[PDB]
Amino acid sequence: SMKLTIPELSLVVLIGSSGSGKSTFAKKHFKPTEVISSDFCRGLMSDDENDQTVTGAAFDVLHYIVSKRLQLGKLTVVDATNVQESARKPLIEIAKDYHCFPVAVVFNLPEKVCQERNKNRTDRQVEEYVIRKHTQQMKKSIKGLQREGFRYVYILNSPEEVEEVVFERQ
Amino acid sequence: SMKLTIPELSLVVLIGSSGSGKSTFAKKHFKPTEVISSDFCRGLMSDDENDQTVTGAAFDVLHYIVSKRLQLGKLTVVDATNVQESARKPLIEIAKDYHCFPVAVVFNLPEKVCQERNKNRTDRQVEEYVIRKHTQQMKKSIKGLQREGFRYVYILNSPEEVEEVVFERQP
Ligand SMILES: Nc1ccn([C@@H]2O[C@H](COP(=O)(O)OP(=O)(O)OP(=O)(O)O)[C@@H](O)[C@H]2O)c(=O)n1
Ligand SMILES: Nc1ccn([C@@H]2O[C@H](COP(=O)(O)OP(=O)(O)OP(=O)(O)O)[C@@H](O)[C@H]2O)c(=O)n1
Ligand SMILES: [Mg+2]
Ligand SMILES: [Mg+2]
């Protein structure tokens, strides 16, 4: 298997395009309450799904909920795309502020894998150009992750590697 | 700074071309006895320095010394190029056998940086084609490090990042 080591108290940041399988991964490895997703926070602001305007407020709520969990010393997983540096920086700063280890888990899958899963989703789907952009941004992000402030950086390079992950909470 | 976390008991494997600054790094961060270099083991087999005719035997000696240290539960740093998978696999297997974390520290520096430092070395120098080959092999190695068995993988992308490294050992 592929053992990923994380401290008992950490902020685990999922990084991947839409369709890369982040939420599936989160549900398999973590308890429901450990996981905080952007879609969930969007749902706190709106019953609808297509309202492009609640996004900023939703991310504010995401950051605040994450902040209070870490304050209480509770391991937290951020289920969002996180392919942009601007999305990643505040998570890192929150983690440092509460003396937690920020951990990056990167879903370095080929674009066609994401595009394929997207077309078969039963919950919601995105436009093709969105996944293409996410993937390009994801790839651009990899090299600078350690320097951004992530203490552990784990790159998953194929669905097989993703499948074989086991977490080891020292 | 750039904090690199390592368990109290680990095998730290330095990965980089000649001239990338591994031994400098080792001396700055670790105690002399924690560090085992290929040059040193070559020196056990031959007075002729950087002697190439004793290379295999020297690596056998390096593997054996590393093995006994981990057996005694002593953190060990392997100061060698380590840019080939064949050089890295046995280190990983030794670490596993003694229930130790293998940790990879990669000196992902541009070739020209290594070539430049090489020309100014006062101890020993290598041919330019050697550093070019090392660098290409180093770059090819990076992606598969985790899958090879390294528990923590640290990539240093510039001399600045290398400079700013501080190790954090928690037992
Ligand atoms: N190992 C996996 C992971 C995901 N999927 C498929 O991918 C689709 C969506 O995966 P999801 O986990 O929702 O991807 P996310 O990264 O969460 O996408 P988003 O950012 O849009 O939430 C699901 O229908 C699922 O069938 C799959 O077949 N096998
Ligand atoms: N930050 C650094 C580190 C090293 N050097 C110089 O670069 C040369 C090679 O450094 P060294 O640690 O000896 O490189 P290694 O990677 O150990 O080379 P080898 O594989 O040959 O042992 C030395 O002159 C050293 O003074 C430097 O100028 N600045
Ligand atoms: Mg999802
Ligand atoms: Mg050296």
From TrEMBL, chain B:
Give residues annotated as binding Mg(2+) 1: 23
Q: Which residues bind dATP?
A: 18-24, 121, 124
Q: Which residues bind Mg(2+) 2?
A: 23, 79
Where is the chain membrane-spanning?
A: none
Residues that bind CTP: 18-19, 21-24, 121, 124
- Residues at which GTP binds: 18-19, 21-24, 121, 124
| Sites where the protein binds GDP | 19-24, 121
Q: Where does ATP 1 bind?
A: 18-19, 21-24, 121, 124
Query: Which amino acid positions bind UTP, per UniProt?
Result: 18-19, 21-24, 121, 124
Which annotated residues bind ADP 1? 19-24, 121
Q: Which domain of life is it from?
A: Bacteria
Protein name listed in UniProt:
Metallophosphoesterase
Record lineage: Bacteria, Bacillati, Bacillota, Clostridia, Eubacteriales
Q: Covered residues of the complete protein?
A: 1 to 170 of 870
